[PDB]
Symmetry: C2
Subunit: 290 residues, 2 copies
């Protein structure tokens, strides 16, 4: 095996960002999705809280632990040796929790983490809250990361556009950047002009969130690129299509008594053989044998 | 939220039931949830599907704890009887005992143990030898004494490597040892199904895995041929993988996922499936001063 180090992975990720061509970053909720993405030719992967929790059959409500997220992230790197950006929500607690989350991700050889200014958890009764923490509140958290894990590329998410306003978001963004963030995820900017303007007023590479059925139209990556973005995520797609596929094949087996008609909708044992690199284990066992 | 004994006694009733029991493989909780919503009454945790989901080959390099934690996820999501492929029990008799308790703790209904030999020798990785009959008998004995409430399926690979006769002999011994049902891998034809059925003192499980040594019989046909249950072990992962491939290629080469919108679970169905409402009702219900 020839795995990379975390510091190699973070720098490779940074390179990918600074690159002239836009970086597409697919969400992979598990190691199999991670392997397919790599084989499909993607150079970075995304672990979204949404897809992760949904995989475990849970709601995206911040009830998973940093330990759990760091282990699934392990699975991703262990499988692909690709830079992985991990959505760490708000750091799973305070400055100290954020500090430990940072170490655990470096241990998992995570290349980058995404932290947000959303205020969590939500007050009882108003669990559908939209309030954010103070700018300083995230600033300190970012400083905590830069302190304990300087080898970690930081993407900072802000939901300030839809709750406080455009210029408010720009102000928050530039603060997070000077605090140590290397890139900005501006949730739900509302137009072409807002994208270009935000890019113009903020001194950092920008991330675009291409999640389906959301507040963002289906622009191509090329479109995002000339509009001022240098990376784009497809966070939950892997789980959306998988869940659809369960439904269709389970329906079929229950209805018809057989999976006969869905054979074409399947990865073959041959494709599986090569995907999990079964061969490379064989050459290992025999090389040792002689 | 059923007890382990409840989940085990129901699975056993499902087996003895007149209608053949369909058991789909669910490699994770989401698969598990959909199987439940689809109407299935029991779930399977496949060794091949689990490991591959973690990007590993089925070579017995996952630990019992690993499998135990995934089984835990499945039972938690659905509260359905789950049958877990525990391989050879991940070690000796005392390892088998440990594996059993862990599964009982995880609220697992049934386990499946096989007579293949593990680990496999160098150079003989692709080897296909089984353990001595008593070795598996001792292991079944272990599970009976340590976890009496756990339903036992014993898989024999004897038809393929030894002969049809030894398969029957091994199976019957496993039965008398404590196996509640037997999994006869790769019986060759319907003739061999019935004969084995006539010669084996137990409920039988059919392996309906794809691209294998077994034709695509319907569940009802298996029932007519002697079987009381049938698994669909790797299917969830088989369809999950190909969907990744198609959508990722789409994104990679189109620059966008627009054309896969109809091939996706909606936010609304997601919301439904994970019971997001239940958490709202819990959260808001407590908000009463």
């Amino acid at each position: 095996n020839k795995q990379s180090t975390q510091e190699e992975l973070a720098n490779r990720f940074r390179a990918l960002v600074e690159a002239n061509e836009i970086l597409q970053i697919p969400g992979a909720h598990d190691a199999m999705a991670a392997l397919v993405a790599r084989n499909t030719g993607f150079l970075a992967l995304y672990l979204s809280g949404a897809a992760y929790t949904a995989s475990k059959g849970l709601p995206d409500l911040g009830i998973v632990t940093s330990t759990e997220v760091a282990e699934r992230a392990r699975d991703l790197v262990r499988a692909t040796d690709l830079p992985v950006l991990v959505d760490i929500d708000t750091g799973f607690g305070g400055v100290l929790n954020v500090a430990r989350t940072a170490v655990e991700m470096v241990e998992a050889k995570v290349a980058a983490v995404q932290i947000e200014d959303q205020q969590l958890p939500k007050k009882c009764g108003h669990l559908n809250g939209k309030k954010l923490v103070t700018t300083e509140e995230l600033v300190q958290k970012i400083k905590a990361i830069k302190e304990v894990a300087p080898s970690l590329y930081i993407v900072a998410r802000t939901d300030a556009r839809g709750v406080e306003g455009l210029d408010e978001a720009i102000e928050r963004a530039n603060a997070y950047v000077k605090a140590g963030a290397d890139a900005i995820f501006p949730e739900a900017l509302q137009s072409e002009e807002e994208f270009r303007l935000f890019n113009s007023k903020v001194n950092a590479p920008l991330l675009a969130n291409m999640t389906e059925f959301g507040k963002t139209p289906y622009y191509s990556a090329e479109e995002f690129a000339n509009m001022g973005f240098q990376m784009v995520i497809y966070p939950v797609t892997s789980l959306r299509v998988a869940a659809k596929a369960y439904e269709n094949v389970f329906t079929l087996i229950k209805e018809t008594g057989s999976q006969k008609d869905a054979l074409s909708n399947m990865q073959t044992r041959s494709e599986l053989y090569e995907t999990i690199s079964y061969h490379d284990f064989e050459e290992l066992d025999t090389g040792i044998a002689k």
